[PDB]
Amino acid sequence: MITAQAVLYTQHGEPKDVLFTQSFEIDDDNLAPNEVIVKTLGSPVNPSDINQIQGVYPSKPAKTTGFGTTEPAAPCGNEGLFEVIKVGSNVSSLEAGDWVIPSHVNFGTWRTHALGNDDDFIKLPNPAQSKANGKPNGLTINQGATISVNPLTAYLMLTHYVKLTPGKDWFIQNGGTSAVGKYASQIGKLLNFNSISVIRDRPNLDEVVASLKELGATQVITEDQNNSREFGPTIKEWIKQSGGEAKLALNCVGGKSSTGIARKLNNNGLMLTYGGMSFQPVTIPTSLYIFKNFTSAGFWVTELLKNNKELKTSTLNQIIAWYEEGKLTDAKSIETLYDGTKPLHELYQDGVANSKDGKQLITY
Template sequence: MNSIKRLSPAAARGTSALLRQAGRPQQTSTTAQRLGAWEPVRHKSGPYGYTQAKSLVYSKYGEPKDVLKLHTHSISPSFPQSTVLLRTLASSINPADVNTIQGTYGVKPTFSPLIGTTEPSVIPGNEAVFEVVNVSSPDLKVSRGDWVIPAKTGFGTWRTHALALEGDVLRVNKQGLNPTQAATAFVNPCSAYRMLRDFAEPALREGDWFIQNGANSGVGRAAIQLGRLWGYRSINVVRARDSPEKTQELKDELAALGATHVVTEDEFLSREFKDMVAQWTRGSREGIKLGMNCVGGKSAQTIAKTLGPGGAVVTYGGMSRQPVALPTGLLIFKNIRFLGFWLSRWADRDVAAKERTVNEILDLIREGKFKDVPTVEVPWSWETEEGVLRDAVQGTLEGFRAGKGVFVFGET
């Protein structure tokens, strides 16, 4: 490839923190197959060295099926100093991404016309792994062929390529990993990691108990596995499936990951549950020290009631869309603490801690000690139609899911 030309001052003025909204394809990369050989493929290029990129965008809030569009744009072969050109290998679809498109999430993105959309738009997506296909200087901390992840939230990952400032990405060791593993390691696993480590007072020790609802979710599965590795014992609440056989199959699946006990919501909310907990935790002087809540409503209250004195309920989601009520007696007599956790705030405030946590999780994956979350891979090549991508996003919040949706990029 020819050396990179510097932009003129006038051309460079368009680049800023919003630079990550742009992107472009380049020459060699890999096809995102979970298993098998990685082979270089050719990518779309236009005349005069320009490369073609595609991005999912939206210019107003609403349901993904109504507002998401697939936008094609060209990227100049010249790009500014301290930037890296990235090709997306895999990008996950998280419920928070859908909530952001709907306009119901806790933070609102900035709409911009930077990639040439007719209206100011946003590229959604926060979790992905990219391959570096070119750099503006050999002196940067990343090189061609490296894998990187976004350093902060709001990067915009549902696109084939991206142009980013060097400081906007973190290098990860790609050895022993496939793209889907790397692309799903820093939302759900990091959330579970930080809640288990940071909120119990005193910190959880080997043999201690925690309880969680939404145990079949990505965060729940990660918490079960990390708890097993660290010697914690867990009570895990799930929604019953369509038949007793399917419910038992789910319970067995979570037990194989390391869950100590798995109960359905009906069992959890029954009068007998208190006696079940007393029997399970007998001999534990402090009782259950930590509760992790992603449901809200009655489920969150029941979690609080199971905790021992000084326990903490950490809320990181609200699937039921019902408020978390704070029982007065638990606050006064048992000093139960109610806290919230937002991964985006933690990650953006402490990028170095995010990098350490992600690398530890990836090491566990390489060693076979941490199992991938079940995924539903959505192939994205240059010919993939807008409707296929849009439907994959729309289905994220609908009913029981076979796994977490992940865009897996082929020849782009």
């Protein structure tokens, strides 16, 4: 028997008010033929995790007595890296020591262990396997724990909707320093797509600009530059010199920022909105729709892949390969190790409260 800990809530609200830690047992000596028991290695705090707890997210884990609690309760977290510790008699796809991520959302990753079916997980190579197989690198725990949403989102937005001609065409995106923004710059570099990253100004602008260009952004401009009508000629010249067109805009800000990047696309452009800044609607001038054949659509990785495991598999495999090859890098998470000296839910509450410092990863 294993004694596990899970972060739960019986009522929606701010994480700081409703979360608590529940101890529960998993019987590793009584596994059904297709069952698997995993131990969590690390799981991040993402905005969607927080929105589910707040009760304002379209998809949420069902409440249950499953973790034994006194009163219906729901688990937290959708992303995370786990390691198989034991499998049932009919399990062949997974073995002890294998690294896995959940195959579906609402898994409840803010906990120490989980019991599921082999098909509730997707295997990733662990460092030992990558190294034994001759790869230059193995995935880090943060890379594995955060591989399921952000890297796939950047890859899919850049390749699944419009075909950018290598060396010539451009995409433009705001939220340039976001996790997805940084993955998109790298994927653009790897696939030879030109790109303009728009970012908020900051005290260390030059350092940030150099960093994004090294990741792969062709040009980096501030939101002030994005707002400048007088800057239009420079952008047009960048595009003219490459012999391509700006065909795709990635928006995660809305408001004036979305207006600015939409205006920089050539005729027949597509904008994909995949995030938004708290109560800032996507704002597009009427003229772009009428005269520039502009289209504005959405992107939600969860919905896109729900019934396309193959597309998901192919995408995940490419991100895994690039990590092993040392061609892709993650932004570093601030890691907080759970050692039992502080309640697990408190580590996540601090994570939620400190999200402004950087991505928070609770490790085990």
